[PDB]
Symmetry: C5
Subunit: 257 residues, 5 copies
Amino acid sequence: VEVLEVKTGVDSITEVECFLTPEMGDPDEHLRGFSKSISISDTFESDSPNRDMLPCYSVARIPLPNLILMWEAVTLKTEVIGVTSLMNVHSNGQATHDNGAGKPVQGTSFHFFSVGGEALELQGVLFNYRTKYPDGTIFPKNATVQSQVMNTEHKAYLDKNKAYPVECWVPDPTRNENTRYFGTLTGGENVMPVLHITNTATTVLLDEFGVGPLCKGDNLYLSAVDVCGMFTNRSGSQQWRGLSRYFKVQLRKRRVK
Amino acid sequence: VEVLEVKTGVDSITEVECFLTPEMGDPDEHLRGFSKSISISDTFESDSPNRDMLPCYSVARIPLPNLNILMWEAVTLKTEVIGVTSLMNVHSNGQATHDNGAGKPVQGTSFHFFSVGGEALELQGVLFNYRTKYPDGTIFPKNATVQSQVMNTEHKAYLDKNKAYPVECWVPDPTRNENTRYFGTLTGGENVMPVLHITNTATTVLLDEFGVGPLCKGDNLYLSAVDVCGMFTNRSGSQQWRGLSRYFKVQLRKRRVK
Amino acid sequence: VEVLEVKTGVDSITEVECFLTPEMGDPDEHLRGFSKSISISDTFESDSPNRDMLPCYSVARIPLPNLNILMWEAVTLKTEVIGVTSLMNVHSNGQATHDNGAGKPVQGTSFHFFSVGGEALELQGVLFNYRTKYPDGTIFPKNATVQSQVMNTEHKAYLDKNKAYPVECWVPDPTRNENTRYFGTLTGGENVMPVLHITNTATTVLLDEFGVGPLCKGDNLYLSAVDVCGMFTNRSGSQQWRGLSRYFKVQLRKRRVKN
Amino acid sequence: EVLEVKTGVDSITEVECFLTPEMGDPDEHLRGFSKSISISDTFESDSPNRDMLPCYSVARIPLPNLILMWEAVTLKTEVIGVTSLMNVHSNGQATHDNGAGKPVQGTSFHFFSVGGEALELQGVLFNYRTKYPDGTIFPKNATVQSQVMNTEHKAYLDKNKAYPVECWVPDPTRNENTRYFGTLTGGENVMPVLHITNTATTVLLDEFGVGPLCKGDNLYLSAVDVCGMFTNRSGSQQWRGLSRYFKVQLRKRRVK
Amino acid sequence: VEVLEVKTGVDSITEVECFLTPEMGDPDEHLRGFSKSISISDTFESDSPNRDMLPCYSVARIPLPNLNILMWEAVTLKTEVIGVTSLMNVHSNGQATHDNGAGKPVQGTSFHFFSVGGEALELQGVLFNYRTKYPDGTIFPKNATVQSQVMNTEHKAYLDKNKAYPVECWVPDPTRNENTRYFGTLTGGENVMPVLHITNTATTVLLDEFGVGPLCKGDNLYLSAVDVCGMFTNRSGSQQWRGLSRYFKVQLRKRRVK
């Protein structure tokens, strides 16, 4: 595809606005947004997490006005939704010390988002190649010990919700030319969430040549992970807590050959 | 709808200067700026916080000089937290850091937030625990379901009353608020250390990318804030939220609209 | 006051250079730059700190060359905390980090603050606990009510005397101070770690958005500071505030004004 | 003498690859991990096993055969598999009773370099009496001065799984034809902060607009990404490393 | 000194490149780069540190090609700490973090400092404790009084000797050093985690706001550094300072002066 001129006029722009809910495991009917309590295996060889203990990537495919012209994603506004809910320290939490308030959600986090004109492309990497991933997840197949550092057989598309576990997959930096992605892993038991919200911040999606993601088939792909940390209940057991993510994307019509 | 030119001349500008006090719960007549001590439910199902244990959003609606079409447009903001040094009182019924130590300072989870708009801040409800029973005298997300733990679009509100909207169940609705500029930071964790900056040399510009600030409908300016600074730990170890007031200085100019 | 042109030439400019020593409480003749050990009250109603336990704002009023209308305009500031490496003394009566370890260094809650103005820094009172009884020899919010814990507009003052205005009672009043530029950071918590930078290559510009700095009424420059670096913990576990001096260098120029 | 840049569609090329970490690989299942760390009784008796010592990674990448030289102009790079560190259910020591496993945390070193020849190294030893093991390349004739600076300890990063991270740093007195960047974050309580994006580029050009020039049409990439330590249920700790992605843009440059 | 034009031509520039080794106390023949283990006095009065427990400032006087009038002018600096990876040795008689764990790395209070000037760094004495009794072989503030704990202007000195001036009682004098550029950071706390960046792509410009860098008196360039990285804790729990060398590359040009 050669990239030619942007179309102008009143009908040459459009806006997509939506939210992506987190997929943390949802271990029962009251615990949407949470994972199952985490259990620890006795040995590397016996690691076999249940499905409801594994946070997964979220993805949405948004149809665009039907249009060679293609919609070009130019700017993004994005925000984690419900940051203040993490101030509930009065609900079945373990106390920080005798007579203290409950521990807030804290510890290891992953905040990630992407915007593309096609599915986010994934590369599989495993903490422990002998981990037995559960049915209903899509995970790196034919794992070897090299899968612990880099096995290039582990290629996938983020093309399904509640399916691709966060811990097995990262964006593939060798692909994804038609996607812009951003993530931060902050690891450690003592990690303290720092969540900013504002309606004044914009990310520009144009590459160095001034071209944004081009939406194949008139579809925009949004992807997210917002694992905010772990919630600790009274017994000390811990579970992941996630939050929804807002996306506002501006697009314009671009001609290509 | 259609924004035209800015008016010039000495009479074309005005300023609003004020402070918003915090509403942390005020459990008795000596404890303004504090919540009630925090307790913990045995289960999610039994979570029923007291009114005086829940910090709320602060709001002020400020009448501007009558114009009539012209509208006041908010252009700049200076803001700061008032009384940061009071958190150096570590000798007033605090729990000692260790044997013979000084009192622990206010610390832990904090939320700092302010907004400026030409109409009420628009809110979206999100709950940590949908079975939380919110108390009488608060305005909270109604008909809560388990989906309210992540996103339930039913939960819409306006920040149009003080001591009413609990912080923990409401956030600025990013799908609305076209005519408002908002800024917030949640810093979460038991070991969070307050970092509070003060200066009179910093200004935030409120213009959007087309150079247009909030436009004040009916000649009203809306200021909103939350400054939960952390928790104060008393000698027994029980903890209560501590908040501080926020100063606002807004410059506005007349703008013609159709 | 209408502000007009800047004067130029050899002696259109002058420089002020000095240090402000900290006023931490100075509980005996060997403890300059420290407070008294902190003790904790049993209740809010019984909080009555002794004077030597309360750090105070430092201030100097520096007379400038008589001009008369012209006024001296404060244009740039260089500033630096003096003696930062003194805090590496971990061998002097401190409490060991663990068995056989070095002494704990000064750490924990800090307030670093400085201001330059053409008149006294203007203060607003805010109290952690309105029932606190402040001691004789200090200037503190009077007629305190429960509203003083958040905002009571009665508590207005000028930083016009040393060893007098306790840091915990007073902040710069953001509703005033048009003729002062102030800057401050409170970093609170037991686990706060001091981060102190020094360099002679950094300059802060004092001009406002119109290109006008502080204008020195009666030819006086007002410098104010607090540098509570944290707390020193001695062998017994008791803790006391430790502060350091602050260097100021201000360039000023002559400015013509009307009225 | 460096002269003009060549233009035309044949004048640019691109190198893209991953460097795997070399953490020690103590058994056939533990690629990316070191052996459990044990501690010597004295400085004099410090003698770590090979599989306990992370090493620098390096790849020499051949370029299209070309006086013209390939000039390295820009770099995109990130750590690959950052999310794998969210596995807190695999034989980890629990944070507290009934809690999740501790994540990888503690001392980290993240390092990358791009050059037109092998990275040049200077040796510095924590403890000069450390006996380094067979199969590593380490500062020879160590003296007590080697603990601060002994200029005899010079080497080229010209072999994988060989140069231990703790012995060697880039020689700042050399490396005129390499650009290097590294951060050591030290302490038991260090928490990994790992950013990924395909939108960030590092420019490799010096202050005269000249990037690394590839001698013999070879590009040298080097890395260390020791992310911290994993603690298993017994409390013993091993280094965990991750791979690093490199994409380098290059252009043809004439030289005399 | 009125400063005139810069010379040009091939011969008008020169470069100084070297390493300054740290002076941490070197308590025995095997422990170069370390201090003696730290012990604590029972009173301020009895504070008597041994010489080998006291890190000192490092300095090098580098003679430059003889010029005469012309002076060498220091224009740019590359600098970095050498050996940052040695701090990953957590297997050498360190105290375990916990049962069966690795040894604690170097951590805690640090001071990183460097300066370039055309004459000795000028120093001001400040004392944590004015009654500290500094040892023979060190150069320390004389006639200390209680005012020395905050500012006593009698305590002036030149950094004109190696392993002599202890770090803890001297800082750069901000009322002087017109002809030097200095940069330092103290990061204090038992829980300080060292963050050490290395790169050969960073340059510090030494020119002042008038475009004039340090002018080298008698054709001598003065380099100074302190890099106390933290403390090493051995198995017994005793702790000692650990330092590293610093690289300096300075570009200088000939400048005419009257």
